[PDB]
Write a protein that binds this ligand. Structure first.
Ligand code: BCL
Ligand code: BCL
Ligand code: BCL
Ligand SMILES: COC(C)(C)CCC(=O)/C(C)=C/C=C/C(C)=C/C=C/C(C)=C/C=C/C=C(C)/C=C/C=C(C)/C=C/c1ccc(C)c(C)c1C
Ligand SMILES: COC(C)(C)CCC(=O)/C(C)=C/C=C/C(C)=C/C=C/C(C)=C/C=C/C=C(C)/C=C/C=C(C)/C=C/c1ccc(C)c(C)c1C
Ligand SMILES: COC(C)(C)CCC(=O)/C(C)=C/C=C/C(C)=C/C=C/C(C)=C/C=C/C=C(C)/C=C/C=C(C)/C=C/c1ccc(C)c(C)c1C
Ligand SMILES: COC(C)(C)CCC(=O)/C(C)=C/C=C/C(C)=C/C=C/C(C)=C/C=C/C=C(C)/C=C/C=C(C)/C=C/c1ccc(C)c(C)c1C
Ligand SMILES: COC(C)(C)CCC(=O)/C(C)=C/C=C/C(C)=C/C=C/C(C)=C/C=C/C=C(C)/C=C/C=C(C)/C=C/c1ccc(C)c(C)c1C
Ligand SMILES: COC(C)(C)CCC(=O)/C(C)=C/C=C/C(C)=C/C=C/C(C)=C/C=C/C=C(C)/C=C/C=C(C)/C=C/c1ccc(C)c(C)c1C
Ligand SMILES: COC(C)(C)CCC(=O)/C(C)=C/C=C/C(C)=C/C=C/C(C)=C/C=C/C=C(C)/C=C/C=C(C)/C=C/c1ccc(C)c(C)c1C
Ligand SMILES: COC(C)(C)CCC(=O)/C(C)=C/C=C/C(C)=C/C=C/C(C)=C/C=C/C=C(C)/C=C/C=C(C)\C=C\c1ccc(C)c(C)c1C
Ligand SMILES: COC(C)(C)CCC(=O)/C(C)=C/C=C/C(C)=C/C=C/C(C)=C/C=C/C=C(C)/C=C/C=C(C)\C=C\c1ccc(C)c(C)c1C
Ligand SMILES: COC(C)(C)CCC(=O)/C(C)=C/C=C/C(C)=C/C=C/C(C)=C/C=C/C=C(C)/C=C/C=C(C)\C=C\c1ccc(C)c(C)c1C
Lengths: 44, 69, 44, 69, 44, 69, 69, 44, 69, 44, 69, 44, 69, 44
């Protein structure tokens, strides 16, 4: 009903699918690099 | 609550904890609040620099302790 | 009556519900992490 | 109050403590005042860096004192 | 008469009421914290 | 999940992990999200400065080790 | 005053102390002047960092002097 | 004649009156604080 | 490629190396990409500060070596 | 269907061609300079 | 003056000291020139930090000299 | 012919007159202060 | 020149030294290019800080040499 | 065909002429100052 962003609910849900893809890709790659860094040196 | 305010003229009463939500009649959150989140991120970074500089916090003295890989 | 933000009073109240949710979530998580940090080291 | 001002021409009298509220006829608070709050946040951070650097304030010398957990 | 901010004089006065509330709240809380800090340590 | 929130009034239930996607009804990603990516870049730079300052990480002590060219 | 200016062509005379107010025909103060005030705030912070670093000014050497509480 | 700022000449002159007030107030207060600082310590 | 994603619901498949170009349906490059180039410039400056601080790189120890003029 | 960027799908694909050109040019030149720097000094 | 320029094609001649004023057909000074003045302010601050750091300039060694009050 | 800045050629030339005034004033004052600084101390 | 590009599809040929000028069909210089000049100013300041820190350049060791006034 | 910058191809080419002039002037002056700096001190 005239959302503040100017996006419809359908647009918002589709975008959120793409955003979740980006977030999870970033999280998984960061987790891999963290495991590798910890193997190299634990930092605690 | 209505606190005493330094040359208020009393046509509009404030009573604010109840009259929050009214800031959003001035601040449009579609244009702000990502900038405000950036402010919060800057605050986060500064308080972290400070805390990590305090003795014992963070990892400046603990890089190799135990359970290594 | 043509609010400065361009939001109606109803929009403002609904948004404030969401904003209070965000604020309180942030406050509670920060409080938990503070309790844990204090247990680890009190800083005074 | 009307203070003397360096080549004012006196058609418009100022009298300002009373004629505040008139700045908001130039500054639209819907577009500003989140930026002004960001300025206030920067001021807050700078005065805090300064004060915390002064001897005795903050937690640089008090990390472990008493009542621990 | 078509003010530069796009606010009417009435809007400007109402906003200034709210702004004075904010300013004075900030001033009073800062004054309290200053008194407490001075009691703890005067800094001059 | 529905967490308890400090003076919520319960007409609008939150239940948020499911009601994400709804932030994008306030935040237009065509105007934001490059700014948010800039925030993420700043975070990246700051965490890297910190980590590279920690002993053993980065290349401050390893510039000439072996297998040279 | 009319100062000599390096390849002015003299159709428009300047005479400026009188012809201030004319900058506001280019600079709209509703969009600027909060940014200009931010510039002034930055100037304020920088001159204060400098002055407080000078010996005797500020509170770096006076934290506990007298009249304590 | 359609000024670049969108202000008329009359608007520009009125604003300049207000701006000169601000400038001179700032200058005079700064001068007072400078005199006080110099009395405290001349810095040259 | 289609990677597994943490509470995706599978009406829209991603397959992204092929479905790049689609970011430009959200990010208008006429308004961004000079800001993104500024981000890249900041990255360039930071990685250069770091690399030039590493021993042997840059010109901190080589200002007068040979072939002078 | 009224994309959020205001670009059509065809505009988006054409731009992406140009963007990939830029990205790959930058990557290849950086790779060359890295090889040269490593030859000069390996940094690990 | 017309300087030789690296793959100019000569339909449009430049001759620029005369063809300044033409930059203002691209740069609207109502939207810029307060930002440009901010750039000039940053330049001013940086050159001042540098000059004040040079021996003899500024007030780092002259805080109490003579004619006190 | 619909210039990119939205200024006409006449507006551009008039503005450039004002801009040259500003530039030259700044240059001349800076030159004076430089001469004074050099007299005080040459810096090379 | 046409360089090989990593998953280009060849409907649009690039040939770019000739097909510059085409960036200005995406980047509007009336809105950019003062920001780009600000980027260039930042680059200028950073390279100057670096160069002035190198031994022999600038005026850190030459403040009083000769021909004084 | 409704370019993303809002410039026509002719506007883009004319602007690029001006931009190339600026770029080359900057490059040539920088090269001169570099030659002078190298003569003064080579930095490698
Ligand atoms: C180094 C020795 C002294 C010192 C010497 C000086 C000197 C010397 C000066 C100041 C001035 C100022 N000092 Mg100091 N000061 C010191 C320590 C402090 C401390 C502190 C935590 O200890 C504080 C809070 C301050 C605070 C301040 C500011 C109130 C003021 C600059 C404001 C300004 O220019 O706004 C610029 C205006 C703006 C950014 C826009 C408007 C913003 C708001 C509205 C400003 C409100 C207050 C202001 C006074 C109002 C001016 C009227 C105009 C109509 C806006 N000083 C030390 C101890 N201080 C300077 C000054 O200008 O006083 C006027 C000044 O000349
Ligand atoms: C290192 C030895 C000297 C020193 C050496 C120099 C030298 C050398 C120079 C200056 C110049 C300046 N110095 Mg210094 N200066 C020192 C210490 C100080 C101290 C201080 C707290 O001690 C202050 C307040 C200043 C202040 C200033 C500025 C007024 C001025 C730069 C303004 C400018 O470029 O605006 C740029 C313009 C803008 C950002 C836009 C307009 C902003 C407003 C309107 C400016 C108003 C004032 C200005 C003079 C007006 C110019 C006219 C134009 C029409 C705008 N100096 C030390 C002690 N100073 C420089 C200068 O340019 O003087 C003109 C200069 O050449
Ligand atoms: C380290 C040894 C030397 C040194 C070595 C060098 C070297 C090496 C170089 C410079 C260059 C520059 N030096 Mg230095 N320089 C030193 C000390 C100084 C001092 C000082 C206070 O002592 C000053 C004021 C300067 C000033 C300058 C600038 C004028 C110039 C960079 C401008 C630029 O790139 O704009 C970039 C353009 C913009 C940001 C946009 C336009 C802005 C305005 C219009 C620029 C006007 C002036 C400019 C020359 C015009 C170029 C033409 C174009 C059509 C815009 N140098 C020390 C002593 N200097 C560099 C240069 O590029 O010269 C051209 C350069 O190569
Ligand atoms: C600093 O450290 C110290 C100080 C030293 C130490 C302290 C320290 O470390 C701290 C405090 C750290 C704090 C960190 C925090 C809070 C991090 C928060 C991170 C978040 C929220 C990340 C979100 C990422 C989100 C991401 C990647 C999303 C990406 C989305 C993408 C690409 C979508 C594209 C797409 C692609 C195609 C199509 C067709 C479409 C439509 C889209 C949209
Ligand atoms: C620096 O330290 C030093 C200097 C070293 C030491 C000093 C120091 O430390 C200092 C001085 C610290 C000062 C700190 C201060 C003042 C902090 C102020 C904090 C505030 C005001 C926080 C507000 C948070 C607010 C929050 C999280 C709000 C979140 C809202 C959210 C997510 C809503 C989404 C949503 C979701 C879904 C839907 C559908 C909708 C519509 C919305 C809106
Ligand atoms: C850095 O330190 C050094 C360098 C180390 C040392 C030097 C140093 O320290 C210096 C120099 C310090 C200088 C400090 C200065 C100049 C400070 C100036 C402060 C000002 C002007 C504050 C204004 C605050 C104004 C405030 C809070 C206003 C708040 C308003 C609010 C919330 C209205 C909401 C609302 C709510 C509901 C509704 C319905 C509506 C409509 C509204 C509007
Ligand atoms: C950094 O230091 C170093 C680096 C260590 C040392 C070097 C250093 O120090 C240097 C170089 C310093 C250089 C300083 C310079 C150049 C300063 C220039 C200052 C200027 C131009 C100030 C202008 C102020 C202008 C002011 C306050 C104007 C205020 C106007 C106001 C409130 C109007 C409201 C209103 C109110 C009511 C109504 C109804 C209306 C309509 C209006 C408009
Ligand atoms: C900091 O370091 C530390 C902290 C010390 C150490 C840590 C450190 O190092 C780190 C963490 C580094 C992280 C780095 C990362 C994440 C880098 C990400 C880089 C990316 C995404 C680059 C994208 C480039 C993209 C590029 C060049 C694209 C260029 C496109 C161009 C020109 C198109 C024009 C055109 C031309 C003609 C025409 C006709 C058209 C239409 C167009 C569009
Ligand atoms: C940092 O230093 C190091 C790093 C330590 C050392 C290195 C260093 O130092 C370096 C590299 C320095 C480089 C410096 C450079 C490149 C400087 C370039 C300066 C320029 C381009 C200045 C232009 C000024 C232009 C000016 C003032 C123009 C003012 C115009 C004005 C007021 C018009 C009003 C008006 C008034 C009335 C009316 C009615 C109208 C219509 C108008 C428009
Ligand atoms: C930092 O250093 C370290 C970190 C210490 C060391 C590392 C370091 O150094 C590094 C990494 C440096 C990297 C540097 C790089 C990448 C530089 C890239 C530079 C570029 C792209 C410059 C472009 C300039 C472009 C220019 C001047 C263009 C000017 C155009 C002008 C005036 C047109 C006007 C006009 C005039 C009249 C009319 C009528 C019209 C229409 C126009 C348009
Ligand atoms: C917009 O949202 C964002 C910014 C985007 C983010 C979200 C956000 O804003 C959030 C989360 C906000 C949280 C806000 C809070 C927690 C606000 C808390 C406010 C409080 C606690 C105010 C207290 C005021 C007290 C007064 C005023 C006392 C006066 C006392 C005297 C004694 C007054 C004296 C006095 C009075 C009159 C005269 C005449 C005189 C002479 C005197 C002495
Ligand atoms: C928008 O997107 C961007 C920004 C552009 C980027 C993407 C982005 O946003 C991403 C990736 C986001 C990830 C978000 C996550 C991971 C969010 C996670 C949120 C969580 C975990 C919230 C938890 C809340 C818990 C509560 C609230 C507990 C309360 C407990 C008590 C005990 C409350 C007590 C209490 C309650 C009421 C009263 C009255 C009283 C007195 C008390 C004490
Ligand atoms: C827009 O353009 C700009 C920004 C303006 C500039 C240009 C730009 O963007 C450029 C140049 C971009 C280059 C981008 C690249 C190079 C992007 C590369 C992306 C990659 C490599 C993604 C990889 C993702 C991997 C995943 C997701 C793996 C998951 C694995 C598990 C095991 C997942 C586990 C899991 C899953 C689900 C559940 C439920 C659970 C429990 C688990 C554990």
């Amino acid at each position: 009903a005239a959302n503040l962003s100017g996006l419809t609910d359908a647009q918002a849900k589709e975008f959120h699918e793409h955003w979740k893809h980006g977030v999870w890709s970033w999280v998984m790659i960061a987790s891999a690099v963290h495991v590798v860094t910890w193997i190299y040196q634990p930092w605690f | 609550k209505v606190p005493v305010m330094m040359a208020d003229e009393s046509i509009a009463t404030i009573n604010h904890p109840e009259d929050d939500w009214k800031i959003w009649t001035v601040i449009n959150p579609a244009t702000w609040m990502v900038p405000f989140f950036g402010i919060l991120f800057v605050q986060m970074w500064l308080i972290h620099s400070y805390a990590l500089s305090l003795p014992g916090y963070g990892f400046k003295d603990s890089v190799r302790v135990a359970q290594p890989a």
